[PDB]
Amino acid sequence: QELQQIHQYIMALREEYFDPSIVGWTVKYYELEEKIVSLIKNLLVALK
């Protein structure tokens, strides 16, 4: 459960202090990271 909270905090840190040029190159990229996060989540389930 805390994996998602860490992901959300790291995600909010991108816009709470920085103003990058475009959003699409970022957010989609961000979603890619979530994929790996999901993968980690998956492993957790397997571990259980």
Kindly write down the DSSP assignment for every residue of the chain, as one continuous string.
Answer: -HHHHHHHHHHHHHHHH---S-SHHHHHHHHHHHHHHHHHHHHHHHH-
Residue 8 vs residues 5, 36, 46, 47, 48: alpha-carbon distances, Å? 5, 14, 23, 24, 24
Instruction: Report d(CA 45, CA 48) in Å as an integer.
Output: 5
State this model's resolution in angstroms: 9.0
- Experimental determination technique: cryo-EM
